[PDB]
Structure formats: C-alpha cells, structure tokens
Amino acid sequence: AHRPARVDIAMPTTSSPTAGETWLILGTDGSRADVIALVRPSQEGVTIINLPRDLTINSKGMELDRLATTYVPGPQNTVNALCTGLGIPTTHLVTIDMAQFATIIDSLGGIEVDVPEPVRDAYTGLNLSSAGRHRLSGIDALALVRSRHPEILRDGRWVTMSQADGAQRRSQSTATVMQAVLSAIGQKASNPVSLHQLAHTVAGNITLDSGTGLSDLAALGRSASKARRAGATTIIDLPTGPRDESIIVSPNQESRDLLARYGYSPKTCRPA
Ligand SMILES: [Co+2]
C-alpha cells in the first residue's frame, strides 16, 4: 500500500538555460536539515553536490541563515533560500526523516563504510570499536551523519575535537554514506524480486512535493543506473574556504564557480 507523504511547494523560477532537472534531497532532524544534496541528472551522467549544513547564505532579500536553519519554517524556506543565496532552482523535492533514513538503509541491507579509527558519540549513540569495512545498519549510518561531537582515541583517551573538525568529519561521513547508498542501490537493482518490495518501501518512507511524480523518481533512478554503468556518477562536496579560518562559513569564489559550471547563479534565480 505504501504511498509517499506530500508537501505543497512553490518551485522557484529561473532564466538560466544550463539549470535543468535539479532534485533537492533533504535529510531531516521546528526541524533542522542535517543533509542537503542536489542531484543533477544530465546527458554527461549524474552529479551529486553535497551542500554543507553549516554554510551561511542569503536566505531572504538582505538576510543571512545557515543551510540547516532554513528548514525550521518549512521546506519552502530551504527551497527559496538556495535560490536567492546560491542560485539553485529546485525542480523536484525529496525529504527523508531519521526513521525514514534508517528504514531505507535497512531495506538495502545496510551500507559498507570504511571506518578509519574507533569513533564514538554519546549524543548520537555512535560506537565503532574498530577500523575497516563495517556494514553499518540504519541507526549506525544515522549516528555517523548526525555525529555532532565525535570522540576519538588520542594518547589512550577519548578526546573531542574542534567544531570545524566535527563538521569536516560529517561532510566526509555524509559523502561516504551517499556513495555507499548509491552503491547499495545498484547492488539491489540487479535482483528482480528485491526491487518490487524495495521500490515499494522507499515510496512509503519519503516525502515528495505535490508536483513531483512517483514516476519522475523512476526516471531519476533509471538515469542514475545508466550513469553507474557508464562510470559517469560523481559526488562532490561544495568547496568552501578553510572552516577554522573564519567565524561564519560563507560561499567563496571556488564554490561560486563549481556552482556556475552547472548553471546556478543567484542573479538568474527567483522564488514564488
Ligand atoms: Co504498502
């Protein structure tokens, strides 16, 4: 029976030619966006741009908010903020909560993520006792991406690191998770019996905007499969300046160019 939850979103408008189909995937935590990624299907392949949650942008005409904070008054604010601040005109919207993320990952049979060293987090409940390939469950993967204050073993002691250190490990963990998700998706796309229940469960553990079709989601998956086989599937983190070299983490020239390549510019994007 599984049907996706629906949200009415007024999609932004653009004058840009290069900005084609752009999906906004939001990992949800009065709510905060823990994960913000833009999935770009094209004729070259598929590119995923992971937008750091702590990144501050121009949310509404002459006002600044962090990406994670834009989700609080609703997805409409995040969709609008990305447009006025980064120039990304959202074509489709996917929203996944904590329980939805853990269900989806456990429906994939978990994800294989390399752990460089034993990590723990009292807040998220993360405890990885050894380094190597780990096959993380839904709850483990969620604890890894949510890891606010990761404790690590230094000089025989559990030690916390800087806020920038933790945000860097988060973008890195989300990047690994995103790749592990993509890899597990294709590995489950080989078997026929799997897909039927898998595609059914995914639909029931997702929130979509009113204008995006369950069939539009199938086309994304179809263009992603074609891009996995062609070796044209790429995941990139938005190149922001040294995180511990400024109080506020703002988009730099590197970030603007990388976004300009894919046809995103604030000057050419308009909400409502
Ligand atoms: Co059902």
Residue numbers in the entry: 78 to 106, 126 to 368
How is this structure described in the published paper?
The widely conserved LytR-CpsA-Psr (LCP) family of enzymes in Gram-positive bacteria is known to attach glycopolymers, including wall teichoic acid, to the cell envelope. In the actinobacterium Actinomyces oris, an LCP homolog here named LcpA is genetically linked to GspA, a glycoprotein that is covalently attached to the bacterial peptidoglycan by the housekeeping sortase SrtA. Further biochemical characterizations provide evidence that LcpA possesses pyrophosphatase activity and also functions as a phosphotransferase, catalyzing glycosylation of the cell wall-anchored protein GspA. Altogether, the findings support that A. oris LcpA is an archetypal LCP enzyme that glycosylates a cell wall-anchored protein, a process that may be conserved in Actinobacteria, given the conservation of LcpA and GspA in these high-GC-content organisms.
The structure of the extracellular LCP domain (eLcpA, residues 78 to 370) was solved at 2.5-Å resolution. Electron density was observed for residues 79 to 106 and 126 to 368, which form a single domain that adopts an α-β-α architecture. A seven‐stranded antiparallel β‐sheet forms the core of the protein with a total of eight α‐helices flanking the β-sheet on both of its faces, forming a hydrophobic tunnel. The tunnel is ∼23 Å in length and is lined by residues located on the central β-sheet and helices H5, H6, and H7. The surface of the tunnel contains many nonpolar residues consistent with it interacting with lipid substrates. Interestingly, during refinement additional electron density was observed near the exit point of the tunnel, defined by helices H6 and H7, indicating that a ligand was bound. The best match to the data was obtained by modeling the ligand as a PEG 4000 molecule that was used as a precipitant during crystallization. This ligand is bound with 50% occupancy and defines the exit point for the tunnel distal to the active site. In A. oris LcpA, R128, R149, and R266 are conserved residues, which cluster together within a surface-exposed pocket (shown in red). Intriguingly, unlike other LCP enzymes, LcpA contains a disulfide bond, formed between residues C179 and C365, linking the C terminus to α-helix H2.
